[PDB]
mmCIF file of C-alpha atoms in Angstrom:
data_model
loop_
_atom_site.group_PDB
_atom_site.id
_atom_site.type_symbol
_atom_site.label_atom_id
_atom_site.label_comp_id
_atom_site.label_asym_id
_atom_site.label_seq_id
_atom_site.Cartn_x
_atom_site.Cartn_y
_atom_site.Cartn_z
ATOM 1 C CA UNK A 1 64.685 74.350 -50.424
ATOM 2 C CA UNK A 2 63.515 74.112 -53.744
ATOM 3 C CA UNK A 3 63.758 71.891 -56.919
ATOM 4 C CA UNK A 4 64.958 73.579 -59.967
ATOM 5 C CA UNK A 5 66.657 76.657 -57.451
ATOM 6 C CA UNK A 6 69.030 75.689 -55.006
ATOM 7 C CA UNK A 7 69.441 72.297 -56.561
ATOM 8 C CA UNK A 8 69.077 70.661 -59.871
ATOM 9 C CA UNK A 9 67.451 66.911 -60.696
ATOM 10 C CA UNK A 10 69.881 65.544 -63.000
ATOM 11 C CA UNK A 11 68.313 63.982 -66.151
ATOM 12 C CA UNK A 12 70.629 61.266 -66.408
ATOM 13 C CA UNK A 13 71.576 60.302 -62.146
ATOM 14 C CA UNK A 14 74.069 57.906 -61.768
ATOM 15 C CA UNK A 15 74.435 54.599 -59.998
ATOM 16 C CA UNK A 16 76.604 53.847 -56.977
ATOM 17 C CA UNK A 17 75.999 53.849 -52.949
ATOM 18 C CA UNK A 18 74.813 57.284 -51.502
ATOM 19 C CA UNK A 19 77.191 59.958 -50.916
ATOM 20 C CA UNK A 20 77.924 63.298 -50.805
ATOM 21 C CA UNK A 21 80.578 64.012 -53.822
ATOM 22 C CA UNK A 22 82.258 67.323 -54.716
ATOM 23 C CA UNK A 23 84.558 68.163 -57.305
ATOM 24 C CA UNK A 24 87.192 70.951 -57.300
ATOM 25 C CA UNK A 25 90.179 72.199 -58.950
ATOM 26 C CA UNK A 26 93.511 73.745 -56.774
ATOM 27 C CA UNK A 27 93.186 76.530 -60.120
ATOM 28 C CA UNK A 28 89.933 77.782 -59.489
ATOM 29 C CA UNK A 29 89.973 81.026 -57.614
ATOM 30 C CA UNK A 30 85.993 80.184 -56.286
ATOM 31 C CA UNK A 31 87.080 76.794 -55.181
ATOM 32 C CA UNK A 32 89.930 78.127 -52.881
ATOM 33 C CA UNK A 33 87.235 80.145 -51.352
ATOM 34 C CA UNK A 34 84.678 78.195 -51.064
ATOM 35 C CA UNK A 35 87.529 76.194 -48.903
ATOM 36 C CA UNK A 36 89.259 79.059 -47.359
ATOM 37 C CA UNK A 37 86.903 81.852 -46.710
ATOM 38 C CA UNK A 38 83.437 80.110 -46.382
ATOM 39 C CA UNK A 39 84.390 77.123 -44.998
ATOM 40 C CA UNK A 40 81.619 75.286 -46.830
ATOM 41 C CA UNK A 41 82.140 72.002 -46.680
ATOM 42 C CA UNK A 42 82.865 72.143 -43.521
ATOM 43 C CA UNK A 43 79.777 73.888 -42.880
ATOM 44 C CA UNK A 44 78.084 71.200 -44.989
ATOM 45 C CA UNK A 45 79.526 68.429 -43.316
ATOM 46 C CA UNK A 46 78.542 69.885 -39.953
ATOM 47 C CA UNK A 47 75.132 69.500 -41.162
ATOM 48 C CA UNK A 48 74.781 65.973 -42.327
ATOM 49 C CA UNK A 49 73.829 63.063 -40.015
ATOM 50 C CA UNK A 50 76.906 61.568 -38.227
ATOM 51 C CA UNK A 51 78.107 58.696 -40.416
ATOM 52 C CA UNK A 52 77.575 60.296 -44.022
ATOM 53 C CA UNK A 53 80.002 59.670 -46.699
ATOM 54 C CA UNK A 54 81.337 62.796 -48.200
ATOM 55 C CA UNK A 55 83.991 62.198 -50.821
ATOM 56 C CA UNK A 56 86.131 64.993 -52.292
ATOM 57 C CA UNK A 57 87.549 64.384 -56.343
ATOM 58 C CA UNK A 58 90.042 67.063 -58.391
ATOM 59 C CA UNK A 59 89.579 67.850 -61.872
ATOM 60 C CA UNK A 60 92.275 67.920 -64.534
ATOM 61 C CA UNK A 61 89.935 70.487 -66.780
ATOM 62 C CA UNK A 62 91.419 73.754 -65.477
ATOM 63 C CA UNK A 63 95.305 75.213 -65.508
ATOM 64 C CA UNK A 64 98.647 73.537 -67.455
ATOM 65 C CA UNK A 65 99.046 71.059 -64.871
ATOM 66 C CA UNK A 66 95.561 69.973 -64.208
ATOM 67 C CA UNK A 67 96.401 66.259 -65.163
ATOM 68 C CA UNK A 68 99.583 66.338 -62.603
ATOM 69 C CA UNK A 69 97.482 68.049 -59.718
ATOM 70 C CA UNK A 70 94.442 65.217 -60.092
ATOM 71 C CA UNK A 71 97.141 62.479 -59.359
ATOM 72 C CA UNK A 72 98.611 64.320 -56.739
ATOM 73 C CA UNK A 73 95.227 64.624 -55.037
ATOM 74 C CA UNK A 74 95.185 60.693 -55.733
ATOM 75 C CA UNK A 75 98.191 60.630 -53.622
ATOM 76 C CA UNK A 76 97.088 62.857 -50.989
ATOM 77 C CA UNK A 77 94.134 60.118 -51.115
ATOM 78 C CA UNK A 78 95.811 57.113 -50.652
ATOM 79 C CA UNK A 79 98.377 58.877 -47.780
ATOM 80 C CA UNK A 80 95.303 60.316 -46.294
ATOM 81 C CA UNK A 81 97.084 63.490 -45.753
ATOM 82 C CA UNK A 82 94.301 65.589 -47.259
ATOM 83 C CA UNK A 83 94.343 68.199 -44.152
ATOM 84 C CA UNK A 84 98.170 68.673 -44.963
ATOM 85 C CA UNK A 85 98.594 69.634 -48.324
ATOM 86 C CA UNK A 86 95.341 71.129 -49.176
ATOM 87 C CA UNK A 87 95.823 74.556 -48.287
ATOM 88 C CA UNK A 88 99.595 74.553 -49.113
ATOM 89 C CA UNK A 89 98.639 73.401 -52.836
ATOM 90 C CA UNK A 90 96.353 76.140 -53.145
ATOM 91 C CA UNK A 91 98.547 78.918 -51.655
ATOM 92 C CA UNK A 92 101.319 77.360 -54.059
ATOM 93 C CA UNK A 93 99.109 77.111 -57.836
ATOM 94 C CA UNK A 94 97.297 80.574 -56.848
ATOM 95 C CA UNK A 95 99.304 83.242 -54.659
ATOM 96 C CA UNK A 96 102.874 82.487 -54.986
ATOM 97 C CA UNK A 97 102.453 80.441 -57.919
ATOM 98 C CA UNK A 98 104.973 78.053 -57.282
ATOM 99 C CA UNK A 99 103.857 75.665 -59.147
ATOM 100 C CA UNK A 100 105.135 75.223 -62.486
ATOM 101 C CA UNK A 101 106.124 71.584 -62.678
ATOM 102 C CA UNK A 102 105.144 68.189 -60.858
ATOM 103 C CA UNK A 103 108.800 68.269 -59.121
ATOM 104 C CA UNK A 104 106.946 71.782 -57.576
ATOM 105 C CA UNK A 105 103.721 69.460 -56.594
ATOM 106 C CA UNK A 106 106.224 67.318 -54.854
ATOM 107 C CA UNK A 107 108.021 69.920 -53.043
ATOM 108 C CA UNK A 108 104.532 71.075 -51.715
ATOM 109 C CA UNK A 109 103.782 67.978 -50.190
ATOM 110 C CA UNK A 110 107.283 67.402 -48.795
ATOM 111 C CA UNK A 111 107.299 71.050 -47.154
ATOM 112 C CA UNK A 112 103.914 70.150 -45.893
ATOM 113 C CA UNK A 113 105.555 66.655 -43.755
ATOM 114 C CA UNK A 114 104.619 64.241 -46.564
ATOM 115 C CA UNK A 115 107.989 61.734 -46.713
ATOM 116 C CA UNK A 116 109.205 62.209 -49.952
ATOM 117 C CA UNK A 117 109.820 58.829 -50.511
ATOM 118 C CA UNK A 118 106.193 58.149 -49.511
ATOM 119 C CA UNK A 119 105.276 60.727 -51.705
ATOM 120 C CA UNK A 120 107.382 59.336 -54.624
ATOM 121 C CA UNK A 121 105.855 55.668 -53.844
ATOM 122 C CA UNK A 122 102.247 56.653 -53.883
ATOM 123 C CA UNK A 123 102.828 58.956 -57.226
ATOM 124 C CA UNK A 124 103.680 55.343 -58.866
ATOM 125 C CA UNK A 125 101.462 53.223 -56.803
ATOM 126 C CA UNK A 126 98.405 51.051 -58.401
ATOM 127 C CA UNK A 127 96.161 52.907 -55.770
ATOM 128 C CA UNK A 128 96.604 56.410 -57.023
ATOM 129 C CA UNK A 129 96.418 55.071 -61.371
ATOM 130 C CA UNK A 130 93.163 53.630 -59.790
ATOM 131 C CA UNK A 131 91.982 56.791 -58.460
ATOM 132 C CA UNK A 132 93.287 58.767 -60.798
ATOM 133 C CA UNK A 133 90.909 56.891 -62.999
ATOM 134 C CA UNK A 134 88.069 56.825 -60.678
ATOM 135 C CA UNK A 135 88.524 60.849 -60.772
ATOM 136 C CA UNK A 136 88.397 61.006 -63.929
ATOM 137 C CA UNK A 137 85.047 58.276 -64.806
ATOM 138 C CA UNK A 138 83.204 59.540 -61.757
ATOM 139 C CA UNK A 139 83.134 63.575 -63.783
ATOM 140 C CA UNK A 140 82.693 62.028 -67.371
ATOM 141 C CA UNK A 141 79.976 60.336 -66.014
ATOM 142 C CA UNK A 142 77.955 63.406 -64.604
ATOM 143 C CA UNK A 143 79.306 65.220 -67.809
ATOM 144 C CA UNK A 144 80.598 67.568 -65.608
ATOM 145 C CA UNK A 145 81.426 70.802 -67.007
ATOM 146 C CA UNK A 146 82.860 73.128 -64.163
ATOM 147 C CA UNK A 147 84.174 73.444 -60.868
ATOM 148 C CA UNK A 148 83.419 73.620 -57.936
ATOM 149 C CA UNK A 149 81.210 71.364 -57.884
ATOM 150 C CA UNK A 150 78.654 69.254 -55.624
ATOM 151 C CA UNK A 151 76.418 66.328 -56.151
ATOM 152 C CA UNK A 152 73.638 63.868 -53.423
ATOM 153 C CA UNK A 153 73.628 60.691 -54.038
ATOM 154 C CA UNK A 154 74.408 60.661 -57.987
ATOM 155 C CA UNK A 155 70.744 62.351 -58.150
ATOM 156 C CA UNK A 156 71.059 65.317 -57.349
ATOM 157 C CA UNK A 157 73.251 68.765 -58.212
ATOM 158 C CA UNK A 158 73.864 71.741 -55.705
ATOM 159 C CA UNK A 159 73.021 75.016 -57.781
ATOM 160 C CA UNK A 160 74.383 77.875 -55.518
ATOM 161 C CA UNK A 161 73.444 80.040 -58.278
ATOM 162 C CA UNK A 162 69.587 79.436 -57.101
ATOM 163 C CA UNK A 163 70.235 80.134 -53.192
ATOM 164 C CA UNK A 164 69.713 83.029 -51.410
ATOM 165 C CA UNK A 165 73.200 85.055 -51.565
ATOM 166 C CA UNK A 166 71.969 88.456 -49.418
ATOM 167 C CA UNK A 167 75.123 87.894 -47.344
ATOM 168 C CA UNK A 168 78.135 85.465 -46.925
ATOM 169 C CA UNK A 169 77.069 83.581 -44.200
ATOM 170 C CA UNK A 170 73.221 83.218 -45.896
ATOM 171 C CA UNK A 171 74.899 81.678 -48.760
ATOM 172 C CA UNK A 172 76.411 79.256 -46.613
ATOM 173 C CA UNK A 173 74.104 78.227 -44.871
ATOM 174 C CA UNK A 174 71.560 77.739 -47.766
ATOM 175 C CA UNK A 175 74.175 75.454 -49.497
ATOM 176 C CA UNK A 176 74.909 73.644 -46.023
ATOM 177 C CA UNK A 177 71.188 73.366 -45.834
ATOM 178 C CA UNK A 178 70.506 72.393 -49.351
ATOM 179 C CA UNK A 179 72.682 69.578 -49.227
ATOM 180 C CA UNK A 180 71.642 68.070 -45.449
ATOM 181 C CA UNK A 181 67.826 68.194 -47.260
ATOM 182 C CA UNK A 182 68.618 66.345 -50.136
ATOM 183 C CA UNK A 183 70.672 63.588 -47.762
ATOM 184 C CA UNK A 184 67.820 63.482 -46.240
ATOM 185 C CA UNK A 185 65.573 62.732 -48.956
#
């Protein structure tokens, strides 16, 4: 695992407690499978000491409804009900694109056994403005340009495009790897 391949040295790190963070967007085709057909962050997390924090933030950048789909991520958040709607919202914005207005968000999340009137609570909550914020501050502040995305520690940025790609499951295993080194470090 090497400096300058399968991860970058940011120039300009950023301050805060160590963690894993990754950044993705329910419109980006590499994201969804990343999630759905490599599995790598769970492959990532499955190689990180037990007790590492690994956060997951959206990104309004990408799609008409980028800005609706970060604050429903907020919600899914603050319900911790992650697991529920993830695949659902990406099956929804990508393949049946069903998603064409934040009353479709909603519907997503109510199909998936969210209570819409937890659902409608959280939307308006000052938990999900705040982490609709944090979303937003945490990317402007590693001038983040794309998705997906993964950082170490504010330090450090995961650069698949360096690892070793001869198959699928070499890929993930180089980025699982790359990450559980720089943890490490």
């Amino acid at each position: 695992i090497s400096d300058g391949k399968q991860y970058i040295t940011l120039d300009k790190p950023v301050a805060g407690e160590p963690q894993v963070l990754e950044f993705f967007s329910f419109y980006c085709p590499h994201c969804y499978q990343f999630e759905e057909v490599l599995h790598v962050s769970d492959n990532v997390k499955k190689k990180l000491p037990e007790g590492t924090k690994m956060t997951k933030y959206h990104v309004e950048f990408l799609g008409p409804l980028g800005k609706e789909l970060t604050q429903a991520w907020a919600v899914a958040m603050a319900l911790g009900v992650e697991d529920k709607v993830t695949v659902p919202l990406f099956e929804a914005v990508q393949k049946t694109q069903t998603v064409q207005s934040a009353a479709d968000i909603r519907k997503v999340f109510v199909d998936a056994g969210v209570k819409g009137e937890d659902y409608d609570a959280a939307w308006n909550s000052f938990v999900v403005k705040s982490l609709v914020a944090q979303q937003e501050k945490a990317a402007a502040d590693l001038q983040l340009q794309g998705v997906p995305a993964m950082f170490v520690n504010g330090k450090y940025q995961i650069n698949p495009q360096g690892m070793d790609t001869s198959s699928m499951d070499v890929f993930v295993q180089q980025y699982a790897d790359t990450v559980k080194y720089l943890v490490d470090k």
